[PDB]
Symmetry: D3
Subunit: 167 residues, 6 copies
Amino acid sequence: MRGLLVGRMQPFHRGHLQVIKSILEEVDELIICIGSAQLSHSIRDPFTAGERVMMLTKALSENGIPASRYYIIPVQDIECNALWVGHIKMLTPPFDRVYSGNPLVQRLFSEDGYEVTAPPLFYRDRYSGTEVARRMLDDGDWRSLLPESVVEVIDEINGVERIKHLA
Amino acid sequence: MRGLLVGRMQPFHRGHLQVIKSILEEVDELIICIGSAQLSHSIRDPFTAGERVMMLTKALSENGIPASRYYIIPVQDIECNALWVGHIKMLTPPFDRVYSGNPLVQRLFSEDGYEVTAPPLFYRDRYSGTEVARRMLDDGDWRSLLPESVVEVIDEINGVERIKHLA
Amino acid sequence: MRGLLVGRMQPFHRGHLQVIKSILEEVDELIICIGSAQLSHSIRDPFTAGERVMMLTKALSENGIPASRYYIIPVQDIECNALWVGHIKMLTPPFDRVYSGNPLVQRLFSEDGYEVTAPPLFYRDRYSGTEVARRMLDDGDWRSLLPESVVEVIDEINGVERIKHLA
Amino acid sequence: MRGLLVGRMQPFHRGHLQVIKSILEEVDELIICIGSAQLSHSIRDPFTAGERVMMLTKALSENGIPASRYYIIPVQDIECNALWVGHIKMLTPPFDRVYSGNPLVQRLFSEDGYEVTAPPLFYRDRYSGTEVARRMLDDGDWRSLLPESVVEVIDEINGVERIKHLA
Amino acid sequence: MRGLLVGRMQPFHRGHLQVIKSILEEVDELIICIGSAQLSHSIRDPFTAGERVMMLTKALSENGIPASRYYIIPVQDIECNALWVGHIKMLTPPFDRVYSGNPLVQRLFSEDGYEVTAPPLFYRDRYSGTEVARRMLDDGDWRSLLPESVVEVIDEINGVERIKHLA
Amino acid sequence: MRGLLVGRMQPFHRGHLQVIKSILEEVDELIICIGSAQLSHSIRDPFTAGERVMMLTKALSENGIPASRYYIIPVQDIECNALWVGHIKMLTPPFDRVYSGNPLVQRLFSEDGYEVTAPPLFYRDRYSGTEVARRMLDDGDWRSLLPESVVEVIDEINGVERIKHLA
Ligand SMILES: NC(=O)c1ccc[n+]([C@@H]2O[C@H](COP(=O)([O-])OP(=O)(O)OC[C@H]3O[C@@H](n4cnc5c(N)ncnc54)[C@H](O)[C@@H]3O)[C@@H](O)[C@H]2O)c1
Ligand SMILES: NC(=O)c1ccc[n+]([C@@H]2O[C@H](COP(=O)([O-])OP(=O)(O)OC[C@H]3O[C@@H](n4cnc5c(N)ncnc54)[C@H](O)[C@@H]3O)[C@@H](O)[C@H]2O)c1
Ligand SMILES: NC(=O)c1ccc[n+]([C@@H]2O[C@H](COP(=O)([O-])OP(=O)(O)OC[C@H]3O[C@@H](n4cnc5c(N)ncnc54)[C@H](O)[C@@H]3O)[C@@H](O)[C@H]2O)c1
Ligand SMILES: NC(=O)c1ccc[n+]([C@@H]2O[C@H](COP(=O)([O-])OP(=O)(O)OC[C@H]3O[C@@H](n4cnc5c(N)ncnc54)[C@H](O)[C@@H]3O)[C@@H](O)[C@H]2O)c1
Ligand SMILES: NC(=O)c1ccc[n+]([C@@H]2O[C@H](COP(=O)([O-])OP(=O)(O)OC[C@H]3O[C@@H](n4cnc5c(N)ncnc54)[C@H](O)[C@@H]3O)[C@@H](O)[C@H]2O)c1
Ligand SMILES: NC(=O)c1ccc[n+]([C@@H]2O[C@H](COP(=O)([O-])OP(=O)(O)OC[C@H]3O[C@@H](n4cnc5c(N)ncnc54)[C@H](O)[C@@H]3O)[C@@H](O)[C@H]2O)c1
C-alpha cells in the first residue's frame, strides 16, 4: 500500500509534518512529491528543490520516520493540467491513494480514477507557507511554525536574508 | 561528505550497483540522479523515471544498503549543457565529489570547479545498458547482467515485451 | 474566400455561434481556431481542446452548418506575441480575413498586414465565458447562454462538477 | 464508434488514402491527427501542418468522403513518450480504436489500454513519404504516388522547389 | 573592467541613459542585456527585442558613447530563477560588476558571488517605463521622458498606435 | 542599407571573417546573428554564445572594422523552421539583404520574401568549423585557420582542453 502526497513545501512546516505522520498510519510508504520544483527565489516559492529536499530529509529523519518508508521526488510543473497526473505517474513508483487539500490536485486525480483523501487540517491558521513567509518578513515568530531541523537549514542557507531582499 | 552519481540507469544493472558500492566506501551519502528522466519507450531509454526509481529502490534495499545513505532524484535533461550543472545543483542537496565515466558530465563539472572521479569499470563489456537491451531483443541472457530485484521489476512491468515491440 | 476566427470557446456559447453565423454570410469557409488549447481545469479555461472540439462539432452540426464550410484547429499558446500570427499561419490553411474582438489579436494581425474585422457583439452582457462560469458556480441559469448540444456535452463530461470542485 | 489515425502525412499519399478508406468501413468517424505538426522544411518533414491540412481536405473531399465523417487535428510532438497518449486525448474527441503501423504508437496506446489495429499495407514499396521525397529530388515520377488534389497543392505551394533547395 | 546592466528597456528612457553614463565612468565597457527579450505587444512590454536594440543603438550613439564601449545582448527569460545568472553568463562576455536596482536581480547575482551595485535613481518618479506607457495612453507628455532618438524610433514603428490598441 | 549574416561561429574563423569583409563592401551595417546560442560543449558546437561574442568582438575589432558597423546578436534555435525567420526579425533591427550559404536558411528567408545572397566561398576546404575541430583533436595546425585574436580567446578559455575531453 503506497500513498502519494504532493506539496510545494515552501518551506516544509509542522503542518506538512503532522499530516505526513497521519498518512504513515494507514499506508506502508508515502511518495512525497516536491511540486513546483523549478520555482525558487520568490516570496511564494523561495527555496530550490534541492534545499527543500534537505528540509524534508532532516525533518523526517530527526522525527524518527525511517527513510525506507518514503520517497522524495522533485517534480517541475507543466503547462497542461490535463497531463499533470500522467506527469507524476511517469516520475514516481506506483501508488494507490492520493492525499491533498488542493482542489485542482484532488479533481485531476479524481478524473483519473484515483481515490483522493483530503487529510485533516492541523492549525491551517498558523501552519501555512503564507504565514511562515509573512512572519519572516515582519520579524514575527516563524521558527515556531517549523520543525527544528527545518529552521537549521533555513539558517544555513540564509533563507530569511534572501526572502527579505526579495520583498 | 556527500558524493553525486549521475546515470540514466536504463536499466539499473550490476555495473551500476558495484560502482555505487565502491563510492559508498569513501562517502557518507550518495546522491543518485536518474538522468534523462523525461525519456522512455525507446530502445536506448525504455523505462520511465518512476520505473527506474523502483529498480534502484529494490536493488539497493535488497543489497542491504541503508536508505538513509542515498537520495534518488529524477532529473530531466535541458537544452543548454552550459546550465546543466546548475540544473543538478538546484534539484539536489549539497555535494563535494562527482562520480562519472561520462566525458561530458566530467568536463562540465570540472569547468564548474568540482572534483570529478571516474570510478573503475566493472566488466564494461557485459555490464552496459546497450548490452542489456541487445540481449533482451535477441533472446540472450540479460537476467545475468542485472540485480535480481531489477529483473523482477522488468518482469512486473513487461519490459521485454515493450522493448521488443519497439524494435 | 476563407476567413479566420480565433477563440478560447470556454465554453462555446450562443455569442460564439451567432458571430460564426454572421461570418459565414460573407465568407465561403471559416477557420475556427480553438486558442489556448493547452489550458484546461481552471475557472477561466475549464475544458480541454478535445472537449471543446466536440462542443463546436455538435453545435455547428446541429445548427445545420455544413462541415465542409469550416475547419476546427486547436492552437496552443506560445511565449512570443511577435510570432503568434506566424504560429497560426503555420497550422492553418490560407485565409484572407480575420475576425476578432480581442485587441491583441486584432493588433497582431494588423501589424502583419491582414484586414481585421471586429464582428458585432451579440448580448456581450450574458453571452460571455465569464458569465457562463459565473452562473455554473452560483447555480444560475447557464444552460440558456449555451447551444443545447453544448449543454449536453458539458453534462456528459461533468463540466459543472469539475468547475465547482475547482472554485 | 470513433477511430483514431495518427500520421505525419509528409505528404498525404495514396497509401494514406486507401487505409483511411478501409477504416471508414468499420468506424462511423475517423479522427485524423497530423503528427509532428511543428516540423516543416526538412527532407523528412517538408510541409507545414497548415499545408498538410489542405492536402487532406482536398483529397478526402475530392474522394467523396463526407466532411462530417472525420476530424483533422494537428498535433505537435512532446518530449515524453510517456505522456504522448494523454497529449492526444487532451486535444481530440473520444475514440474507441486506434489505427497505426508505427510500433511506438501501437505500444504506447496498448500500454494505455486501447485496442490497436495495424491496417493492411497498400504498396508500402512505393506509397511511402520516403519514396515520394526520393522521387521529387531525383526527378522521378512522384505524382503517381499521390492523390491528384495533393499534387495540385504541392504545385501551388512550390513543394518540389522547396525540397530540392533543402537537399 | 567590464560591468553588466540588465534591463527590459520598455522603452529605453532618460533614466536608463543617465545610469548607463554613470556606469561608464567607473568601467571600461558595459554589457547591456535587454531582458525579457521574448515579450512584446503588452502594455508592460510593448516593444520587441529588435526594436529595443534600435532604441539603445541610436540613443547611445547619438549621445556620443562609442560603440566599442558596450555590448547589446537580448536575453529571453527562463522558468528557473536559480539558473538565470548562469543563463546570462552563458550568453555574455566575462564581467566583474553587476548594476541593478531590481531586488531579484541583485539577490541572484549576490548568491552567485558577484558584487552588485544599485545605481543612484535619476528621477524615478517620471523616468520609469510605467510612467512612459501611462502618458502614451493618456495623451500625456511622454516624449520628455525619452531620448530624442528613442522618440524617433517609437514614431517610425508606430509605438503609440500599438500601445493604445492594446489598452 | 543593413544586411544580415547568420552563423554558428563554432568557432569564428578566417572564412567567416573574409565573408564579413566582402559584405561590408556592399552594405552600411551587418547584423551578425550567432545562431544555436543555446548549444555548447559538443564537438560540433563547443563554445558558448558568450565566448563566441568575445571571439567576434576581438577579431572584428583587431581587423579595424568599426564597432558601429555591425550588431552581434545571439539567437537560440526554435523547434519550428516555419517561425524561424520571424524569430530572427523579432530579435534584430530591420534588414534588407540576407547572406548565407546554408540551404535551409536561404530557403526560409526566400519564402519570406527576402533577397538572399550566397557569398563566395573562401577556402571552404580548410576554413570550416568541422576542419578546425578536426585539427584541434588530432593535434593538427588549427591556429592557421583562425584569426589571431580568436586563437587567443580559445587559449584563455581552454578550448582545446575542453574539446579533447569531450571526444
Ligand atoms: N503543472 C501542473 O499542471 C499542476 C497541476 C496541479 C498541481 N501542480 C502542483 O502542485 C503543487 C502545489 O501543491 P500545494 O499548493 O498544495 O502545496 P502546499 O505545500 O501549499 O500544500 C501541500 C499539502 O499540505 C497540506 N497542508 C498544508 N498545511 C497544512 C496544515 N496546516 N494542516 C494540514 N495539511 C496541511 C495541503 O492541504 C496539501 O495537501 C505545485 O507544485 C503545483 O505547481 C501542478
Ligand atoms: N541536459 C544536459 O544538458 C545534459 C549534459 C550532460 C549529461 N546529461 C545527462 O546525463 C545522463 C547520462 O548519463 P550516462 O550516459 O553516463 O548514463 P549511464 O547509465 O550510461 O552511466 C551512468 C554511470 O554508470 C557508469 N557505469 C556504467 N556501467 C558501468 C560498469 N560496468 N562499470 C563501472 N561503471 C559503469 C558510467 O561510467 C557512468 O558514470 C543523461 O540523463 C544525460 O541526458 C544531461
Ligand atoms: N500565444 C500568444 O502569444 C497569443 C497572442 C494572442 C492571442 N492568443 C490566444 O487567443 C485566444 C484568446 O481568444 P479570446 O480571448 O478572444 O477568446 P474568447 O472565446 O473569449 O473570444 C473569441 C471571440 O468571440 C467573440 N465573442 C465572444 N462573445 C461574443 C458575443 N456575445 N457576441 C459577439 N462576439 C462574441 C470575441 O469578440 C472574440 O472574437 C487564446 O487562446 C489566447 O491565448 C495567443
Ligand atoms: N511526441 C511523442 O512523444 C510521440 C510518440 C509517438 C509518436 N509521435 C508522432 O507520431 C507521428 C508519426 O506518425 P508516422 O511516422 O507513423 O507517420 P506516417 O505518415 O509515416 O504514417 C502514418 C500511418 O500511415 C500508414 N501508412 C503509410 N503508408 C502506408 C501504405 N502504403 N499502406 C498502408 N498504410 C500506410 C502507417 O502504417 C501509419 O499508421 C509523428 O508526428 C510522431 O512525432 C509522437
Ligand atoms: N528569467 C528569470 O528567471 C529572471 C530572473 C530575474 C530577472 N529577469 C529579467 O530581468 C529583467 C527585468 O529588468 P528590470 O525589471 O529591472 O527592467 P527595467 O528596465 O525596469 O530596469 C532596468 C534598470 O534600470 C534602472 N532604472 C530604471 N529607471 C531608472 C531611473 N529613473 N533612474 C535610475 N535607474 C533607473 C533600474 O534600477 C534597473 O537596474 C526582465 O527581462 C526579467 O525577466 C529574469
Ligand atoms: N531554429 C531553427 O528552426 C533554425 C532554422 C535554420 C537555421 N537555424 C540556425 O542557423 C545556424 C546555422 O548556421 P550555419 O550552419 O550556416 O553556421 P556556420 O557557422 O557553419 O556558417 C555560417 C556562414 O558562414 C559561411 N562560411 C563558412 N565558412 C566559409 C568559408 N570558408 N568561406 C565562405 N563562407 C563561409 C557559410 O556559408 C554561412 O553563411 C544555427 O544556429 C542553426 O540552428 C535555426
